[PDB]
Amino acid sequence: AKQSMKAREVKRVALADKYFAKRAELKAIISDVNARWNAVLKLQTLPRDSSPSRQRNRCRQTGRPHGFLRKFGLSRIKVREAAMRGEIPGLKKASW
Amino acid sequence: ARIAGINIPDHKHAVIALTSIYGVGKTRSKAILAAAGIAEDVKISELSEGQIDTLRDEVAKFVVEGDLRREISMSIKRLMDLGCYRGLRHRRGLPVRGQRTKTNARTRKGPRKP
Amino acid sequence: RSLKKGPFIDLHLLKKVEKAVESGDKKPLRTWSRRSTIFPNMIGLTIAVHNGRQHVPVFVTDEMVGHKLGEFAPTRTYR
Amino acid sequence: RIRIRLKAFDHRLIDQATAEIVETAKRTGAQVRGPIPLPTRKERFTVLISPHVNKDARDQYEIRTHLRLVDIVEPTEKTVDALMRLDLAAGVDVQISL
Amino acid sequence: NQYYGTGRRKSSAARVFIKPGNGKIVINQRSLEQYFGRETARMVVRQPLELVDMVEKLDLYITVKGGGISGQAGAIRHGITRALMEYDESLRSELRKAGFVTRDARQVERKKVGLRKARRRPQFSKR
Amino acid sequence: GQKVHPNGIRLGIVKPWNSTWFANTKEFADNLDSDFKVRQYLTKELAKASVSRIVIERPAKSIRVTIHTARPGIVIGKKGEDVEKLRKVVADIAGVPAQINIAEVRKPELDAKLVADSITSQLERRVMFRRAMKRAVQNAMRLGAKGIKVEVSGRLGGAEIARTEWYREGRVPLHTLRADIDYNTSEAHTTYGVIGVKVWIFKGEI
RNA sequence: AGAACCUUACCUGGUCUUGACAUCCACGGAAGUUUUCAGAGAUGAGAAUGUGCCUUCGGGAACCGUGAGACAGGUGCUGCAUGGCUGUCGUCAGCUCGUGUUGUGAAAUGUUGGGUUAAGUCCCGCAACGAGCGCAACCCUUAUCCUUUGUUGCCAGCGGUCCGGCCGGGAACUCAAAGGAGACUGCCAGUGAUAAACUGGAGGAAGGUGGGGAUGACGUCAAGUCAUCAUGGCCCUUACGACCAGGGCUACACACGUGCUACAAUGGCGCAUACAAAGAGAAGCGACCUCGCGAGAGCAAGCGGACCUCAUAAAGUGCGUCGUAGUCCGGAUUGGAGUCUGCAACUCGACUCCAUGAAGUCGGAAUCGCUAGUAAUCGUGGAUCAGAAUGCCACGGUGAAUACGU
């Protein structure tokens, strides 16, 4: 299969999906530094395997750090082998 | 460059570039900008001709960037080349604004220099 | 302990200290760190750091684990 | 006199867009006549979920949407100052049709 | 009657006035000599306007927010040709057949998502 | 191999899809994972089922999976107990009562999967293949489907060299979208290497 | 398609060796979480808060810590085994067949000729007739108008103008789309075997595919790809397996390929000035407000985006300037002050101000790209972004000649 082995980035930017959309407006004081939270803001050091800063273009097919788009998560270089699938809005090969 | 200035920054707003005159610095910038009477509130559409109308007044009435620096640092020792330590202190690189001579604060040496 | 939790060291000393700890010794390192800390495994040895003036010794002992190099290496000398 | 070609996108958005699209268009003075019972209707893009050999199934996306019947005649200045300044109802399209 | 009209080129949004008299011309708070006389835009921004009624003869209180210099020229042309319909209600055919309301090809072609110029090799000819 | 998969090109045509829908922008990962899990885990144990086609669709938070079987004898099994077990397994994996449907199919002549499987089995049987190729072509032509193409890989006997043959006969307009062409390649691990068989069928027009 | 550790497949050093990856087995029990000691982490010694549910109460569904085995796996070797994909001739006009005909026969014709010519597209003539693949159109955008239609967008006309068209309101209509027509040798005349085709003209916004794309055949090179994946064969599983911690792909003694910067006055300075679109974004831009010459920070509405931000446009013109000054050009380059991204960034973050004013003043041998919006440019942003473009993608602003000729 190999899908699970190369799914390192799948579980890195998934938990926090809705952890700030409805919290930033209400907790803007905590979210925004009132300067310096040298201790509270450094708590991200403890998780060394999943964090917002660890985003690496999730690709379960090959696990490489390339090939992602937050808008739809569609191919940008694999299009060469999947140009007929119709998954190329906005970004397409530049020959025309 | 300016009317009598240098150091043009590329593709920047009015306050960002017009205030590149060498006179403004760390502590003396406030007086120069107060004399100019300009702020960032004016946008490209709201930019007004007062800046050019007051550029000549500010350069003339107030001390020019060049002669100001020359009198502050050079003119004190250019004519008085005696053993007075006041002139040598500025060029020696020792703290003049809180900059230790060697450890990470080699400021007054001029050009970038290890 | 500037981080207030989970102390970590800069890459300055770790350029070669992690190898010299069990590989013997290496040539002097052009290290500019001023916030690194010493470890008890390197008692009697100092990491050559070019803080800006010159090489500065750093004495360490077993009881010192989180002490910083800058604290034990007085380098700044005004006038 | 007012027909709407509603573009359905999803269920989460429509759940609030069924009413919140024009809920802010009437405070005290607007001429909106309020919600209509609006029995079940299927309005969406001219796209089918999966057209197959069976031409009678005509599978289509099922979304509960409500067409706008504002029909204002004399809104007050304050009543419609925020006619479109809505914080909710992701999907909004007031496509009036004479 | 007051001959008003917007017109555009490249998604412009102008406010074109045409009424008898009103010698003063306010083209988006500009000056007549700054956009129509004795300067870079003396005539290039009015080349099609030469064929149609002269600009100086008809007041233009235009707040044209859109288009390049030639884009502004085409927007003004479109606005005037679509605004003087009240002056000549039959122009809907005449100007239509005179090639004055048509969106002139003298513009950057409307494109899908494509190359730098969408018609030639961009400035990276190296392959 | 500059060719392209006809099924992928047929995404915008009434032919059945594999993965396409419109939904919220914050639920792509979980939905894709669920679709991959159900697709992968709904065919591995169907080796003896010989199911003609299983399609999973998720238009908008709804599953309408369709199953078409080829041979009733080989799929009924022990009074359909295996079918019920598979339905329960997929339902518990998805967590919802999937509306499973079974549609009977027959005439194992114009089905690309069945003919490809038969060709692979005959090749594995240690018998001649060109005769089987011609027989399949003529059988397909006899029952309609005016147009068909076949192709086989090499690796014959104890020879490392490989050759490719088509023996095409009829109309196979791959370039034109309006051709309702069907194709499903198969592979067989013979004594020496793996032999791949590709079949294209042009079963009339819309 | 974005390299501080991680990245990264390498080397070094510490560490684990049924694991750090996935299934099964034996032991009991949930775990997760908080604190420690040593450690650079790896882990080793741990301790607790613990202890959700099933439990015909095993002990499992799950995970916790250890152990033997079937093990897994390796960006380790073979594209000179392959599947698939790509570059190559090549958007080149091509490759074949059925029947018929000519020849004892191999074979030829079809597909050799004329024009369109981009052309096995098309037509004509023709022992050839037709057909199967390629091309064209059938696909998307754009050149005009129309059916349907106005929310935020335009504000024709009506009320003042909350002079920006803000509110209703008209959806005439700019803009927008659910569907179409309009270019199709359609026509006048001539050249041309009358034919085809061409030419001169007219019709219309659009004359001889109106302007661009998606569409790459038989093949093709042992082409490359086992390092994207899968994959036959070649090793071994206390391991040429791996976790962790530094570096390296950017290091130099030079050369090459690409682009950018310029070498300026067709430009530079500050002043006034109207100058875009496609896009992107509830883990986001960040409106506005205050400072920082600035970086960006303290405060902050807005939006689920025809509604809130990037976003003001630039080369340009009139205003004074130097009249070619190694220059206010150019910006590398060697420090400081500093802001932010990030636990942490000399090797390997970005950005701003002062200093830096070097080579280079249009570049030899020569060589390459260019067919109308062409070159030539000016920037704008988007994807890649923890972050780090002169790369790449996408948008506009303007805008010529050369194509006589084989």
Curated annotation (Swiss-Prot), chain A:
Signal peptide: none annotated. This is Small ribosomal subunit protein uS14. Keywords: Ribonucleoprotein, Ribosomal protein. Transmembrane segments: none annotated. Binds 16S rRNA, required for the assembly of 30S particles and may also be responsible for determining the conformation of the 16S rRNA at the A site. One of its GO terms (biological process) is cytoplasmic translation. It comes from the Bacteria. HAMAP family: Ribosomal_uS14_1 (MF_00537). GO terms for molecular function: rRNA binding; structural constituent of ribosome; tRNA binding. GO terms for cellular component: cytoplasm; cytosolic small ribosomal subunit; small ribosomal subunit. Gene3D superfamilies: 1.10.287.1480. The gene is rpsN. It comes from Escherichia coli (strain K12). Belongs to the universal ribosomal protein uS14 family. Part of the 30S ribosomal subunit. Contacts proteins S3 and S10.
From Swiss-Prot, chain B:
Keywords: Ribonucleoprotein, Ribosomal protein, RNA-binding, rRNA-binding, tRNA-binding. GO terms for cellular component: cytoplasm; cytosol; cytosolic small ribosomal subunit; small ribosomal subunit. Residues 93-114 are annotated as: Disordered. InterPro entries: Rbsml_uS13_C, Ribosomal_uS13, Ribosomal_uS13-like_H2TH, Ribosomal_uS13_bac-type, Ribosomal_uS13_CS. The keyword Ribonucleoprotein applies. One of its GO terms (molecular function) is structural constituent of ribosome. Disulfide bonds: none annotated. The keyword Ribonucleoprotein applies. GO terms for biological process: cytoplasmic translation. Belongs to the universal ribosomal protein uS13 family. Part of the 30S ribosomal subunit. Forms a loose heterodimer with protein S19. Cross-links to the P site tRNA and weakly to the A site tRNA. Forms two bridges to the 50S subunit in the 70S ribosome, contacting the 16S rRNA and proteins S19 and L5. Located at the top of the head of the 30S subunit, it contacts several helices of the 16S rRNA. This is Small ribosomal subunit protein uS13. The gene is rpsM.
From Swiss-Prot, chain E:
One of its GO terms (molecular function) is tRNA binding. Gene3D superfamilies: 3.30.230.10. Keywords: Ribonucleoprotein, Ribosomal protein, RNA-binding, tRNA-binding. The keyword Ribonucleoprotein applies. Part of the 30S ribosomal subunit. Contacts 16S rRNA. Cross-links to the P site tRNA and weakly to the A site tRNA. NCBIfam families: PRK00132.1. Belongs to the universal ribosomal protein uS9 family. The C-terminal tail plays a role in the affinity of the 30S P site for different tRNAs. Mutations that decrease this affinity are suppressed in the 70S ribosome. This is Small ribosomal subunit protein uS9. It comes from Escherichia coli (strain K12).
Curated annotation (Swiss-Prot), chain F:
It comes from Escherichia coli (strain K12). Belongs to the universal ribosomal protein uS3 family. Keywords: Ribonucleoprotein, Ribosomal protein, RNA-binding, rRNA-binding. Part of the 30S ribosomal subunit. Forms a tight complex with proteins uS10 and uS14. With proteins uS4 and uS5 encircles the mRNA as it enters the ribosome, which may play a role in mRNA helicase processivity. Some nascent polypeptide chains are able to cross-link to this protein in situ. In collided ribosomes contacts ribosome rescue factor SmrB. The keyword Cell membrane does not apply. Residues 38-106 form the KH type-2 domain. GO terms for cellular component: cytoplasm; cytosol; cytosolic small ribosomal subunit. Pfam families: KH_2, Ribosomal_S3_C. PROSITE patterns: KH_TYPE_2, RIBOSOMAL_S3. NCBIfam families: rpsC_bact. This is Small ribosomal subunit protein uS3. The gene is rpsC. The lineage of its organism: Bacteria, Pseudomonadati, Pseudomonadota, Gammaproteobacteria, Enterobacterales. GO terms for biological process: cytoplasmic translation; ribosomal small subunit assembly.
